[PDB]
Amino acid sequence: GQLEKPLATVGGFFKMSVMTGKALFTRPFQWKEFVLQSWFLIRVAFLPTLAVSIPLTVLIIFTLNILLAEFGAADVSGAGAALGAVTQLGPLVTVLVVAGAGSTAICADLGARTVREEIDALEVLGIDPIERLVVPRVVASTFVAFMLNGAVITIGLVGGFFFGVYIQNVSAGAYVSTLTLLTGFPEVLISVVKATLFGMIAGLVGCYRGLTVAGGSKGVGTAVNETLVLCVVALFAVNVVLTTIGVRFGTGR
Amino acid sequence: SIKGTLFKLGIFSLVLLTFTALIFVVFGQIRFNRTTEYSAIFKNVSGL
Protein backbone atom coordinates (compact mmCIF):
# COMPACT_ATOMS: atom_id res chain seq x y z
CA GLY A 1 0.00 0.00 0.00
CA GLN A 2 2.94 2.31 0.70
CA LEU A 3 4.31 1.77 -2.81
CA GLU A 4 0.80 1.85 -4.32
CA LYS A 5 0.44 5.61 -3.74
CA PRO A 6 3.31 6.93 -5.94
CA LEU A 7 2.60 4.09 -8.39
CA ALA A 8 -0.76 5.67 -9.25
CA THR A 9 0.93 8.91 -10.31
CA VAL A 10 3.57 6.88 -12.14
CA GLY A 11 0.83 5.07 -14.05
CA GLY A 12 -0.93 8.33 -14.84
CA PHE A 13 2.30 9.76 -16.25
CA PHE A 14 2.98 6.62 -18.30
CA LYS A 15 -0.56 6.48 -19.71
CA MET A 16 -0.41 10.19 -20.55
CA SER A 17 2.92 9.69 -22.35
CA VAL A 18 1.52 6.72 -24.29
CA MET A 19 -1.48 8.82 -25.35
CA THR A 20 0.91 11.63 -26.33
CA GLY A 21 2.87 9.26 -28.56
CA LYS A 22 -0.33 7.92 -30.10
CA ALA A 23 -1.53 11.46 -30.83
CA LEU A 24 1.86 12.32 -32.34
CA PHE A 25 1.90 9.32 -34.68
CA THR A 26 -1.84 9.27 -35.49
CA ARG A 27 -3.50 12.70 -35.28
CA PRO A 28 -2.45 15.72 -37.38
CA PHE A 29 0.44 17.70 -35.92
CA GLN A 30 -0.02 21.19 -34.45
CA TRP A 31 2.65 23.20 -36.26
CA LYS A 32 1.56 26.57 -34.84
CA GLU A 33 1.62 25.47 -31.19
CA PHE A 34 4.92 23.66 -31.77
CA VAL A 35 6.50 26.83 -33.18
CA LEU A 36 5.13 28.95 -30.32
CA GLN A 37 6.38 26.55 -27.64
CA SER A 38 9.77 26.17 -29.34
CA TRP A 39 10.29 29.93 -29.37
CA PHE A 40 9.01 30.20 -25.79
CA LEU A 41 11.47 27.59 -24.50
CA ILE A 42 14.30 29.17 -26.51
CA ARG A 43 13.61 32.63 -25.09
CA VAL A 44 13.23 31.23 -21.56
CA ALA A 45 16.30 28.95 -21.51
CA PHE A 46 18.99 30.37 -23.83
CA LEU A 47 20.74 33.15 -21.90
CA PRO A 48 20.79 31.15 -18.61
CA THR A 49 22.20 28.21 -20.58
CA LEU A 50 25.20 30.25 -21.72
CA ALA A 51 25.54 31.96 -18.33
CA VAL A 52 25.83 28.52 -16.69
CA SER A 53 27.88 26.88 -19.44
CA ILE A 54 30.66 29.49 -19.77
CA PRO A 55 31.82 29.68 -16.10
CA LEU A 56 31.42 25.91 -15.66
CA THR A 57 33.58 25.05 -18.67
CA VAL A 58 36.11 27.72 -17.62
CA LEU A 59 36.29 26.10 -14.17
CA ILE A 60 36.70 22.60 -15.62
CA ILE A 61 39.42 23.75 -18.03
CA PHE A 62 41.27 25.59 -15.25
CA THR A 63 41.23 22.54 -12.98
CA LEU A 64 42.31 20.20 -15.78
CA ASN A 65 45.11 22.52 -16.91
CA ILE A 66 46.60 23.04 -13.44
CA LEU A 67 46.42 19.33 -12.57
CA LEU A 68 48.02 18.33 -15.88
CA ALA A 69 50.69 21.04 -15.66
CA GLU A 70 51.71 19.65 -12.28
CA PHE A 71 51.43 16.17 -13.83
CA GLY A 72 53.70 17.36 -16.66
CA ALA A 73 51.39 16.40 -19.56
CA ALA A 74 49.88 19.78 -20.37
CA ASP A 75 49.69 19.12 -24.13
CA VAL A 76 46.90 16.53 -23.83
CA SER A 77 44.56 18.87 -21.91
CA GLY A 78 42.43 19.49 -25.00
CA ALA A 79 41.61 15.77 -25.00
CA GLY A 80 39.94 16.07 -21.62
CA ALA A 81 38.55 19.43 -22.72
CA ALA A 82 36.68 17.61 -25.47
CA LEU A 83 35.94 14.44 -23.53
CA GLY A 84 33.92 16.10 -20.78
CA ALA A 85 32.34 18.82 -22.89
CA VAL A 86 30.82 16.54 -25.52
CA THR A 87 29.55 13.80 -23.25
CA GLN A 88 28.87 15.27 -19.79
CA LEU A 89 29.05 19.08 -19.69
CA GLY A 90 26.73 19.50 -22.68
CA PRO A 91 23.94 17.14 -21.60
CA LEU A 92 24.22 18.09 -17.92
CA VAL A 93 23.99 21.84 -18.54
CA THR A 94 21.07 20.93 -20.81
CA VAL A 95 19.52 19.02 -17.89
CA LEU A 96 19.94 21.92 -15.49
CA VAL A 97 18.77 24.78 -17.72
CA VAL A 98 15.94 22.73 -19.23
CA ALA A 99 14.47 21.24 -16.05
CA GLY A 100 14.89 24.53 -14.16
CA ALA A 101 13.50 26.83 -16.86
CA GLY A 102 11.52 25.09 -19.59
CA SER A 103 10.00 22.20 -17.67
CA THR A 104 8.93 24.53 -14.86
CA ALA A 105 7.54 27.02 -17.38
CA ILE A 106 5.49 24.29 -19.07
CA CYS A 107 4.22 23.05 -15.71
CA ALA A 108 3.28 26.58 -14.62
CA ASP A 109 1.55 27.34 -17.94
CA LEU A 110 -0.51 24.14 -17.92
CA GLY A 111 -1.33 24.65 -14.24
CA ALA A 112 -2.53 28.16 -15.05
CA ARG A 113 -4.71 26.70 -17.81
CA THR A 114 -6.06 24.07 -15.41
CA VAL A 115 -6.90 26.41 -12.52
CA ARG A 116 -8.63 28.80 -14.94
CA GLU A 117 -10.76 25.89 -16.25
CA GLU A 118 -9.34 26.27 -19.76
CA ILE A 119 -8.67 22.53 -19.89
CA ASP A 120 -12.32 21.90 -19.03
CA ALA A 121 -13.30 24.52 -21.62
CA LEU A 122 -11.38 22.53 -24.24
CA GLU A 123 -12.83 19.24 -22.98
CA VAL A 124 -16.48 20.36 -23.14
CA LEU A 125 -15.89 21.59 -26.70
CA GLY A 126 -14.97 18.05 -27.76
CA ILE A 127 -11.27 18.84 -28.17
CA ASP A 128 -8.54 16.64 -26.70
CA PRO A 129 -5.84 18.47 -24.71
CA ILE A 130 -3.29 15.68 -25.14
CA GLU A 131 -3.19 16.28 -28.90
CA ARG A 132 -3.55 20.07 -28.92
CA LEU A 133 -1.25 20.94 -26.00
CA VAL A 134 1.05 18.13 -24.84
CA VAL A 135 2.36 16.92 -28.21
CA PRO A 136 3.66 20.32 -29.46
CA ARG A 137 5.20 21.01 -26.04
CA VAL A 138 7.05 17.68 -25.90
CA VAL A 139 8.28 18.05 -29.49
CA ALA A 140 9.39 21.63 -28.80
CA SER A 141 11.17 20.49 -25.63
CA THR A 142 13.07 17.83 -27.59
CA PHE A 143 13.99 20.26 -30.38
CA VAL A 144 15.19 22.99 -28.01
CA ALA A 145 17.17 20.50 -25.91
CA PHE A 146 18.92 19.23 -29.05
CA MET A 147 19.86 22.73 -30.23
CA LEU A 148 20.91 23.88 -26.75
CA ASN A 149 23.14 20.84 -26.27
CA GLY A 150 24.91 21.58 -29.54
CA ALA A 151 25.37 25.24 -28.61
CA VAL A 152 26.62 24.34 -25.11
CA ILE A 153 29.25 21.94 -26.45
CA THR A 154 30.49 24.46 -29.03
CA ILE A 155 30.61 27.40 -26.59
CA GLY A 156 32.31 25.28 -23.94
CA LEU A 157 35.04 24.12 -26.31
CA VAL A 158 35.70 27.64 -27.63
CA GLY A 159 35.74 29.18 -24.15
CA GLY A 160 38.07 26.48 -22.87
CA PHE A 161 40.42 27.12 -25.79
CA PHE A 162 40.48 30.87 -25.20
CA PHE A 163 40.91 30.60 -21.43
CA GLY A 164 43.66 27.99 -21.61
CA VAL A 165 45.61 29.79 -24.32
CA TYR A 166 45.25 33.43 -23.23
CA ILE A 167 45.35 32.85 -19.43
CA GLN A 168 47.15 29.62 -18.53
CA ASN A 169 49.58 29.92 -21.48
CA VAL A 170 49.05 26.45 -22.92
CA SER A 171 49.81 25.85 -26.60
CA ALA A 172 46.88 26.41 -28.96
CA GLY A 173 47.97 23.75 -31.46
CA ALA A 174 48.07 21.16 -28.69
CA TYR A 175 44.52 22.10 -27.73
CA VAL A 176 43.00 21.88 -31.19
CA SER A 177 44.99 18.81 -32.32
CA THR A 178 44.18 16.69 -29.25
CA LEU A 179 40.40 17.33 -29.23
CA THR A 180 39.71 14.27 -31.41
CA LEU A 181 42.12 12.02 -29.49
CA LEU A 182 39.40 10.67 -27.18
CA THR A 183 36.21 12.03 -28.82
CA GLY A 184 34.68 10.75 -32.05
CA PHE A 185 31.36 9.78 -33.62
CA PRO A 186 30.23 7.60 -30.64
CA GLU A 187 30.64 10.51 -28.22
CA VAL A 188 28.70 13.04 -30.29
CA LEU A 189 26.04 10.42 -31.04
CA ILE A 190 25.55 9.51 -27.37
CA SER A 191 25.48 13.23 -26.53
CA VAL A 192 22.72 13.76 -29.11
CA VAL A 193 20.77 10.80 -27.72
CA LYS A 194 21.17 12.14 -24.17
CA ALA A 195 19.93 15.60 -25.17
CA THR A 196 16.92 14.23 -27.06
CA LEU A 197 15.88 11.93 -24.22
CA PHE A 198 16.40 14.65 -21.59
CA GLY A 199 14.25 17.12 -23.51
CA MET A 200 11.50 14.59 -24.15
CA ILE A 201 11.36 13.45 -20.51
CA ALA A 202 11.43 17.03 -19.20
CA GLY A 203 8.57 18.01 -21.49
CA LEU A 204 6.53 14.96 -20.50
CA VAL A 205 7.02 15.52 -16.76
CA GLY A 206 6.23 19.23 -17.03
CA CYS A 207 3.06 18.62 -19.02
CA TYR A 208 1.86 15.82 -16.73
CA ARG A 209 2.40 17.88 -13.58
CA GLY A 210 0.79 20.95 -15.13
CA LEU A 211 -2.34 19.05 -16.14
CA THR A 212 -2.76 17.54 -12.64
CA VAL A 213 -2.30 20.71 -10.58
CA ALA A 214 -4.14 20.93 -7.25
CA GLY A 215 -5.23 24.58 -7.47
CA GLY A 216 -5.72 26.04 -4.00
CA SER A 217 -3.24 28.79 -3.16
CA LYS A 218 0.03 26.79 -3.20
CA GLY A 219 -0.93 24.07 -5.68
CA VAL A 220 0.79 25.61 -8.70
CA GLY A 221 4.00 26.37 -6.81
CA THR A 222 4.03 22.90 -5.28
CA ALA A 223 3.47 21.39 -8.73
CA VAL A 224 6.35 23.41 -10.20
CA ASN A 225 8.68 22.41 -7.35
CA GLU A 226 7.75 18.73 -7.71
CA THR A 227 8.24 19.00 -11.48
CA LEU A 228 11.74 20.39 -10.97
CA VAL A 229 12.73 17.76 -8.40
CA LEU A 230 11.38 14.86 -10.48
CA CYS A 231 13.08 16.17 -13.62
CA VAL A 232 16.44 16.52 -11.85
CA VAL A 233 16.28 13.01 -10.37
CA ALA A 234 15.06 11.29 -13.55
CA LEU A 235 17.53 13.08 -15.82
CA PHE A 236 20.44 12.23 -13.52
CA ALA A 237 19.44 8.55 -13.50
CA VAL A 238 19.04 8.49 -17.29
CA ASN A 239 22.40 10.24 -17.64
CA VAL A 240 24.05 7.53 -15.53
CA VAL A 241 22.51 4.76 -17.64
CA LEU A 242 23.40 6.41 -20.95
CA THR A 243 26.94 7.17 -19.75
CA THR A 244 27.45 3.47 -18.97
CA ILE A 245 26.07 2.53 -22.40
CA GLY A 246 28.26 5.11 -24.15
CA VAL A 247 31.49 4.12 -22.40
CA ARG A 248 30.69 0.52 -23.36
CA PHE A 249 31.33 1.53 -26.99
CA GLY A 250 34.18 4.00 -26.56
CA THR A 251 36.51 5.83 -28.94
CA GLY A 252 39.69 4.69 -27.18
CA ARG A 253 38.72 1.02 -27.30
CA SER B 1 2.61 37.55 -34.81
CA ILE B 2 3.07 33.94 -35.92
CA LYS B 3 5.09 35.11 -38.95
CA GLY B 4 7.66 36.89 -36.81
CA THR B 5 7.85 33.97 -34.38
CA LEU B 6 8.44 31.63 -37.32
CA PHE B 7 11.17 33.94 -38.66
CA LYS B 8 12.95 34.12 -35.29
CA LEU B 9 12.63 30.38 -34.66
CA GLY B 10 13.93 29.58 -38.14
CA ILE B 11 16.98 31.82 -37.77
CA PHE B 12 17.78 30.50 -34.29
CA SER B 13 17.28 26.89 -35.39
CA LEU B 14 19.51 27.42 -38.43
CA VAL B 15 22.32 28.86 -36.29
CA LEU B 16 22.13 26.16 -33.62
CA LEU B 17 21.87 23.32 -36.11
CA THR B 18 24.88 24.83 -37.86
CA PHE B 19 26.65 24.44 -34.51
CA THR B 20 25.52 20.81 -34.17
CA ALA B 21 26.62 20.04 -37.74
CA LEU B 22 29.95 21.74 -37.04
CA ILE B 23 30.44 19.53 -33.98
CA PHE B 24 29.68 16.45 -36.09
CA VAL B 25 32.13 17.57 -38.79
CA VAL B 26 34.89 18.37 -36.29
CA PHE B 27 34.65 15.20 -34.21
CA GLY B 28 33.72 12.88 -37.09
CA GLN B 29 36.65 13.83 -39.36
CA ILE B 30 34.53 14.70 -42.39
CA ARG B 31 36.27 15.83 -45.59
CA PHE B 32 34.67 17.32 -48.70
CA ASN B 33 37.34 16.72 -51.35
CA ARG B 34 37.27 14.55 -54.46
CA THR B 35 39.33 11.40 -53.93
CA THR B 36 40.65 8.43 -55.89
CA GLU B 37 40.58 4.91 -54.46
CA TYR B 38 43.79 2.84 -54.36
CA SER B 39 44.74 -0.49 -52.81
CA ALA B 40 47.84 -1.84 -51.08
CA ILE B 41 48.97 -5.23 -49.77
CA PHE B 42 50.67 -5.66 -46.39
CA LYS B 43 52.11 -8.65 -44.58
CA ASN B 44 50.90 -6.94 -41.40
CA VAL B 45 48.83 -3.76 -41.10
CA SER B 46 49.96 -3.13 -37.51
CA GLY B 47 46.58 -2.19 -36.10
CA LEU B 48 45.53 0.15 -38.90
Binding site: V165, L179, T180 | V25, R31, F32
Partner: peptide
Protein backbone atom coordinates in the same frame (compact mmCIF):
# COMPACT_ATOMS: atom_id res chain seq x y z
CA UNK C 1 35.09 23.61 -47.51
CA UNK C 2 37.10 22.09 -50.34
CA UNK C 3 40.42 22.56 -48.52
CA UNK C 4 39.05 21.66 -45.07
CA UNK C 5 41.72 19.51 -43.41
CA UNK C 6 40.37 19.59 -39.84
CA UNK C 7 40.12 21.72 -36.74
CA UNK C 8 43.79 20.91 -36.08
CA UNK C 9 44.92 22.34 -39.44
CA UNK C 10 43.22 25.76 -39.31
CA UNK C 11 45.32 28.84 -38.40
CA UNK C 12 44.59 30.15 -34.92
CA UNK C 13 44.75 33.75 -33.67
CA UNK C 14 47.28 34.97 -31.14
CA UNK C 15 50.70 33.79 -30.09
CA UNK C 16 54.16 34.56 -31.47
CA UNK C 17 54.33 35.07 -35.21
Amino acid sequence: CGQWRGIANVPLPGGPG
